[PDB]
């Protein structure tokens, strides 16, 4: 159940 | 001429003194053990310490003058004796005629009511000294102090709506993270109860830990009902996310040490939305979480990972959270009650 998102910059 | 809040404070304190009134002295003497000199000693040493910290300068807080602090302390000491009288007259043991010596010899109450009364006074004046300064300079533990906030809001109806909004603000700051620091007395309270954390059903449907976790659970249920409305998720996913947030409080309570409470609620949100067919990304999530009043960016952009070294919410989820919570979440590849 890994998150593959890189950053949380984009709103 | 005076601010709406400075003039409201002056109305409450008008005609009253920095000393017990004849009615409170009649309740102090009714006591087998009269508390008046213990109360006045607590007040003397809280005033000394406040004045010393107010009078001298730190790299982040410039110190200011004796005269504005002696006025600031005097008006807080008038509010104390007023709110103590209301507290004690409205107490059940006064309406039944029983001794209130035990109730009036709890120093943690007297200390934290004088501290709340000083923060009421400081905020009414938009003081550079922001919470948690008063309880930090008065050596008062957040886990013991928050309990007087409900008592002050109930015992002075002259408190402005802004003063109540602020008091409920700082109470949620405590239930969010200042009571979860590693040196908090909460971990003491856990220890004497064999580290068993109360579940939501044990407190919602009288215990330092019981009334702490019932405020924690209530606060987290409010912040979850908002997140689940602005992301249109199913009420049964809300029931499941909430069950994983309970799991991380009861079975992984160390995850909250020196952390924030929405950090473990957002990770409970993503991991249960991902385990089921209602996947919402951390991106979709922080767009709705942003609009919540307690949400500053440091909640999802400066999360403690190990200690020190700080990361962000995605890296805390991937390095720390999923290892300790996948077991439970993968069971949905018994739910807890969600309250109001």
B155: tokens are 């015992």
With both helix axes pointing from N to C terminus, report the angle between B147-155 and B66-89 in degrees, rounded to the nearest 10: 80
CA distance A8 to chain B (A): 6
- Establish how many alpha carbons lie within 13 A of residue B20's alpha carbon, considering only the half-sphere containing its beta carbon: 19
Exposed e or buried b per residue across B260-276, where buried means at least 16 C-beta atoms within 10 angstroms of its C-beta: bbbbbbbbbbbbbbbbb
Q: Is residue A4 less than 8 Å (CB to CB) from chain B?
A: no
Q: Is residue B318 less than 8 Å (CB to CB) from chain A?
A: yes
* Residue B226: alpha-carbon gap to chain centroid: 20
Q: Is residue B81 less than 8 Å (CB to CB) from chain A?
A: no
Give the Cα separation of B215 and B177 in Å (integer): 13
Which experiment gave this structure?
A: X-ray
The single residue listed with the structure tokens 């300064």 is B133
Q: Which helix (H) or strand (E) holds B309?
A: strand B309-311
Q: Is residue A9 less than 8 Å (CB to CB) from chain B?
A: no
Nearest CA in chain B to A5: B314
Q: Is residue B189 less than 8 Å (CB to CB) from chain A?
A: no
**Nearest Cα to B304, choosing from B249, B250, B267, B251?**
B267
Burial class (CB in 10 A: 0-12, 13-18, 19+), B60: exposed
Cα B145 to Cα B51, B114, B152, B244, distances in angstroms:
20, 10, 12, 29
Q: What is the DSSP string of B88-130?
A: HHTSHHHHTT---TTTT--HHHHHHHHHHHHHHHHHHTT-S--
Q: Which residues of B touch A3 (CB under 8 A)?
A: 270, 274, 282, 314, 317-318
Experimental structure resolution, Å: 2.7
Q: Is residue B281 less than 8 Å (CB to CB) from chain A?
A: yes
Q: Is residue A11 less than 8 Å (CB to CB) from chain B?
A: yes
The 8-class DSSP code of residue B196 comes to P
Closest Cβ opposite residue B326 in set A1, A6, A11: A1
Q: Which residues of A touch B274 (CB under 8 A)?
A: 1, 3
Give the Cα separation of B315 and B338 in Å (integer): 29
The single residue listed with the structure tokens 């439970």 is B328
Domain residue ranges in chain B: 1-180, 181-340
Q: Which residues of B touch A1 (CB under 8 A)?
A: 271, 274-275, 322, 326, 329-330
Q: What is the DSSP string of B135-153?
A: HHHTT--HHHHTHHHHHHH
């Amino acid at each position: 159940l890994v998150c593959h998102e890189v950053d949380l910059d984009d709103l | 001429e005076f601010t709406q809040s400075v003039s409201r404070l002056q109305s409450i304190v008008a005609g009253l003194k920095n000393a017990p009134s004849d009615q409170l002295i009649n309740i102090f003497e009714s006591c087998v053990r009269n508390p008046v000199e213990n109360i006045m000693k607590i007040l003397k040493g809280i005033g000394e310490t406040f004045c010393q910290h107010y009078t001298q300068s730190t790299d982040e807080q410039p110190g200011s003058h004796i005269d504005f602090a002696v006025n600031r302390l005097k008006l807080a000491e008038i509010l104390y004796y007023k709110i103590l009288e209301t507290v004690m007259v409205q107490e059940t043991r006064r309406l039944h005629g029983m001794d209130m010596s035990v109730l009036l010899e709890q120093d943690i109450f007297h200390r934290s009511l004088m501290a709340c009364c000083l923060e009421i006074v400081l905020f009414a004046y938009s003081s550079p000294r922001t919470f948690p300064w008063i309880i930090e300079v008065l050596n008062l533990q957040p886990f013991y102090f928050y309990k007087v906030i409900e008592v002050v809001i109930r015992s002075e109806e002259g408190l402005s709506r802004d003063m109540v909004k602020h008091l409920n603000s700082i109470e949620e700051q405590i239930l969010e993270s200042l009571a979860w620091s590693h040196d908090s007395a909460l971990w003491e309270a856990l220890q004497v109860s064999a580290n068993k954390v109360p579940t939501c059903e044990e407190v919602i449907f009288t215990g330092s830990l019981a009334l702490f976790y019932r405020k924690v659970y209530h606060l987290a249920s409010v912040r979850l009902r908002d997140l689940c409305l602005k992301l249109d998720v199913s009420n049964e996913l809300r029931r499941k996310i909430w069950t994983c947030f309970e799991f991380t409080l009861v079975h992984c309570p160390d995850l909250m040490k020196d952390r924030h409470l929405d950090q473990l609620l957002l990770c409970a949100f993503y991991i249960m939305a991902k385990v089921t067919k209602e996947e919402r990304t951390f991106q979709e999530i922080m767009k709705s979480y942003r609009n919540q009043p307690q949400a500053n960016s440091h909640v999802y952009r400066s999360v403690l990972l190990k200690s020190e070294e700080r990361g962000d919410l995605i890296k805390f989820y991937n390095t720390i959270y999923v290892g300790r919570v996948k077991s439970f979440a993968l069971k949905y590849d018994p739910l807890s009650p969600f309250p109001h």
